[PDB]
Symmetry: D2
Subunit: 331 residues, 4 copies
């Protein structure tokens, strides 16, 4: 006998499977911040980590495991092989190529496409009914790439999209008004990053439209330059990268918030990247951010935001650009 | 009139002095993991970050601020100047430097000579929580420079060591670490002491059931559970270059007991002079009761002669280094 | 030596003031539901309970204390004497007279006014710097009564007001749209209860105005009868009382949410009752619900909602009625 | 087109089975306290309530639903019919009414409840709170036909929680850091295991050998005595107990729902242990997870402690053998 048998009498031996498993692919700064935030919010009964760098992967797994006493996630696993990811409810993709100096933006997109050609079939093999959450950049293109390779219905392929853009916007809006971001409502939609769209019409506090109160809101004529609040969202992203070399905490927190709605079937509305073909005159197979209802089936529904002619044209332009890149990709 | 003035009527612009403020000094992997864990546990109404690297500091502050929508800590500030730390209830020190060993210690002492008087100036009634290594020596250094009473100078000590021990114990027994009780005391790190007599599940002593527990003659080699705590630390550093998540989580747990005055018992480094035949001004880990005044009380653990001797040896080593330090 | 002295070495026995204390006055179904919700949200380091019924008070205190192992509030106290309430940051008043009319020659208002005449000076004595949160009905009159007796600045006297009304509205709105109440924005303002005002203009999902999409929203002409959502808020209150005899859980949860913003200085916007003199043509010392910014100083700011002529008239009517009762009250 | 259709575009109408459903049977003070505690801890994606009193049941359901904005449980349902309980992972029984008479009345209540629960949730874990809890866990196990791992009794979980509260008050330490186990028969006949009583792994019995004896100058035996006295005191003062039991049950629910494998003092089938040969349920430290009780801790009991559990087993079996199923 052993001390374990001497101490514990076993009733059943039945080895069970997890009921609420989450996988994070890529254990970089983004991946690990998603992981800690998911662990601290008790969203999973099992967490799996996958990467190609075997040393960093094992080390990251061990560090999280060493914090088990302070967590409510009883099993943390990791591996190069996707068998560790079997029957995940949600799979978060944060894996990506490093831009290699003098490398064209198109070449970098194709290198991420080649990374996805290995990841996505492996994820689908072990978790065919999972929801895919894409973080890796350019997020709108890579959500399309994930959807194309997986063969999943559009509801199960979610792009992080304008979730962080909107979170940064609400932070800045909150600083200007001296109100908590939670009570400062405003939506940044369309293409994630530089080409995103601030929807001035929906910007409000307690249902009081800021555009109705201040008609110059979002225009160049605006004496208070509220257009700078969206400009600062883009500038802040470059500033964080210049100051600390990457972004981790804000993206990790935003992803755990999406994960919460999916895992708990909350049916909360989030600005995430979805297949927008058929909206705003877009005819191409492109993914853009709109407010989506997130639950156990991923994106079950989307909010049909009324956009101005200028806003509609900006999303249309982004669709044309993304399709222009996408049509040239080698699968 | 501005849009803000048209939208909002102001009752009063009076701003209160910080109420549940926490400061983290050093924004390396350890400090930032402490920060995210404290933020996700809603322990503070204000978080301040300090470092000497101004770019990294501002970037770290901004990244946390950008996550405000998903948090319940309304004010996140940072700066090189300690005015940002004013009125903190708890100040966490994670700042750190073939070296001469006494040299490594003296480099961190020189860092503490700048940090500690600045912390004391802006938060004279704060509790100090030391993480920086060698943690037992630097808790002593912080206590000496600050002039604070012993209850307000807490060392992270064997909190991480015990958390790793309970994780490994839990894996061996197929039981959650929370239900696996065991204490690792004395000197943090390599020289720590596993108290085999207190290792239990549901109040059932593992040493009573298995007398060879903790000895070399144990066929099940339970001594390896403590050996793996030390080996795992070297393994994590070899694999990823540093430790962050586990230390971060353990520190936020200490912060919870202090901020909420819980009076829970934690293995932390305290002034041990007068215990286990120790006569020197050294800090070692024992189970301490943590609350709003820091360490108000300590548990008097009955140690075997071998355990007492190991703590005595650690005390002699630590004092040997300490007596040679320039302040 | 005692077992305690053999086991524990004491460093100091310095009695320290509680840092985040909350008091609940009145341990009826409302007070106890506020108490459990505050305890389960870790908002306080000390909870005090006050009532006139000494048996029920002690029993309630003991029951909560017996749950200490599962909580993070280390000290729960109770008493008839207000010394137990000393140094509270927030004091919640849920005390009210027996509804059975025949017990007194005085009305419910008169009865609850005389109760406050004894409670409020005692609360002020032991916690002069506290924030007062009034739940007791008629909540708008008794918030005025608390403000008048206490002598506190308007920012430190908060009425529960239309917080429950708006929470029920968002629940019903959510059921109609198949969206979580969190993502369904809508404000019920003015006088708490039967005479409350649904602000149709601010009703939205993702910043998309429901009134802009559906101009008949809130009118009698509306084929979908959205006006019934507000009617059901009032009907549901009577239905809960008819079915179980009182309301507890929903009010308790709503109060703990207000307590969270105050205790954590969140500066979130809530529909609560505040001194409305200087707004909507109101010149009297009356308290009505408007969206208020809640933090460590209580109500530091209020949102100036643009109301329709009909909406403005309804608040004005409530103000005239409230003042009519109030002017006749003897202090 | 309707406002809903103008506002929202639907991708799919596929409505899955609930993944983390909990049912509470009986909406008295105990059941409702279990409900609020479970809702505030985010343990379920769906909560179902069942009772025989239709008005109180609907009212309780509505009150909880009105708090949805502040919760993370998107669906709260209720009904007299057990179809509302379909596909529950955990079913909590708090329903209830001479001793053998009172037991039989509760057995007759269980004869209706248990087959209905089993019909709609055959793979659920049963958590019994209703008194006498040890007898009614046996009744539930017998009627359901479930394996012993899926029939859990609240047992000495509350007794232990009260013990740790009182131990914490004596020592000036948080109950979490005060370890001590109350086992055997729930209530009046419970057993305090003095050998396991400790703070930071320091045995109180080793420091103070008189601990738990009549000879004890400090009368530590009174801490256990006060656990039983406090239960009568709460009932005398407010008429029932709700908050402490609700919080203790939500803690058990957390370990089961999240498969934590934490050790709890709960009622399990103890035939084969401590010389007990009868089909009786008593509290011992059990490992709780997604399959209910997968394992139990083999606590070393003294001859006196063993005899107390044996006496409880004889009494419980004496009542059980006389029950009409
Ligand atoms: N959508 C957003 O809002 C947002 C915000 C910030 C960052 N990002 C993006 O997230 C991505 C990652 O960011 P990062 O800072 O963590 O980068 P990183 O380079 O530090 O981490 C990427 C990880 O992916 C791994 N990886 C590479 N190939 C792999 C493969 N075939 N299989 C498994 N893992 C593989 C790498 O080894 C590495 O660990 C980037 O594409 C970045 O642009 C997106
Ligand atoms: N006690 C434990 O259990 C435990 C566990 C792990 C790590 N550690 C210790 O924590 C410390 C930090 O670890 P790390 O990985 O984050 O190291 P790090 O070097 O990456 O970070 C240290 C930070 O301190 C800053 N710093 C240096 N001098 C400063 C000054 N005068 N003022 C303010 N900031 C200053 C640095 O700029 C740096 O950002 C180390 O000493 C390490 O050994 C302790
Ligand atoms: N604002 C809202 O949205 C809202 C919602 C629901 C209920 N309410 C109100 O909350 C109040 C209480 O509701 P309830 O169901 O708990 O009533 P309750 O009668 O059951 O409880 C009231 C308690 O107040 C106590 N009390 C009476 N006089 C006291 C005094 N001088 N000092 C201390 N305590 C005293 C009573 O003894 C009793 O315990 C009512 O006024 C009710 O209308 C308000
Ligand atoms: N195990 C413990 O530690 C512990 C602690 C406290 C209370 N209890 C027990 O919990 C039980 C309930 O306590 P209470 O205070 O809530 O009693 P209660 O009478 O107020 O509530 C019981 C509920 O069960 C309902 N019920 C009766 N028959 C039913 C049936 N056939 N189907 C569905 N529901 C039915 C009743 O209508 C009632 O609402 C009691 O048996 C009590 O002794 C156990
Ligand atoms: O916060 C970030 N930082 C990143 C970054 C960069 C290196 S590590 C993290 C960032 C910052 C700035 C630009 C930029 N451009 C980019 C373009 C194509 C790619 F394939 C990858 C990155 N990316 C990645 C990213 O998407 C973001 S959000 C962001 C970016 C630009 C404008 C607005 C927002 Cl809200
Ligand atoms: O997990 C760690 N990692 C560290 C680390 C983190 C970044 S670089 C090194 C570690 C790991 C291994 C050895 C070691 N030794 C050391 C000695 C003196 C010093 F001043 C600093 C470090 N330190 C720092 C540290 O204290 C720990 S806990 C730890 C260490 C050794 C044995 C047991 C434990 Cl529980
Ligand atoms: O949910 C409730 N129930 C109460 C109640 C009643 C008895 S115990 C609790 C309720 C329900 C219905 C009417 C009503 N009227 C009332 C008027 C003056 C008073 F001083 C006290 C009560 N009160 C108390 C109360 O304020 C509410 S909210 C409410 C009430 C009516 C319409 C809309 C809402 Cl959101
Ligand atoms: O806190 C309670 N109160 C109850 C109660 C009473 C009315 S409503 C709830 C209690 C309190 C006191 C005695 C008692 N006896 C009893 C015996 C057999 C039964 F079938 C039912 C009740 N029950 C039910 C109960 O089990 C408890 S815990 C408890 C009880 C007695 C001693 C120690 C503990 Cl830790």
């Amino acid at each position: 006998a052993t001390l374990k048998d001497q101490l514990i009498y076993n009733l059943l031996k039945e080895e069970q499977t997890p009921q609420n498993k989450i996988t994070v692919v890529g254990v970089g700064a983004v991946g690990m911040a998603c992981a800690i935030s998911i662990l601290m919010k008790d969203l999973a009964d099992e967490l799996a980590l996958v990467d190609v760098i075997e040393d960093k992967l094992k080390g990251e797994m061990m560090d999280l495991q060493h914090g088990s006493l302070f967590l409510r996630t009883p099993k943390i696993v990791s591996g190069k092989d996707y068998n560790v990811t079997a029957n995940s409810k949600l799979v978060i993709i944060t894996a990506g190529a490093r831009q290699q100096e003098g490398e064209s933006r198109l070449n970098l997109v194709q290198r991420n496409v080649n990374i996805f050609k290995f990841i996505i079939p492996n994820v689908v093999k072990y978790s065919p009914n999972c929801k895919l959450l894409i973080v890796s950049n350019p997020v709108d293109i890579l959500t399309y790439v994930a959807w194309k390779i997986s063969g999943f219905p559009k509801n199960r392929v979610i792009g992080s999209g304008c979730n962080l853009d909107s979170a940064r916007f609400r932070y800045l809006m909150g600083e200007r008004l001296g109100v908590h971001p939670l009570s400062c409502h405003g939506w940044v939609l369309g293409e994630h990053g530089d080409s995103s769209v601030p929807v001035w019409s929906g910007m409000n506090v307690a249902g009081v439209s800021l555009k109705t109160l201040h008609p110059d809101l979002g225009t160049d004529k605006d004496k208070e330059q509220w257009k700078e609040v969206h400009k600062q969202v883009v500038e802040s992203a470059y500033e964080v990268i210049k100051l600390k070399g990457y972004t981790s905490w804000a993206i990790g927190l935003s992803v755990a918030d999406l994960a919460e709605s999916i895992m708990k079937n909350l049916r909360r509305v989030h600005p995430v990247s979805t297949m927008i073909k058929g909206l705003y005159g877009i005819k191409d197979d492109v993914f853009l951010s709109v407010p989506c209802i997130l639950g156990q089936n991923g994106i079950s529904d989307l909010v049909k935001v009324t956009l101005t002619s200028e806003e509609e044209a900006r999303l249309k332009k982004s669709a044309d650009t993304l399709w222009g890149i996408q049509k040239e990709l080698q699968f």
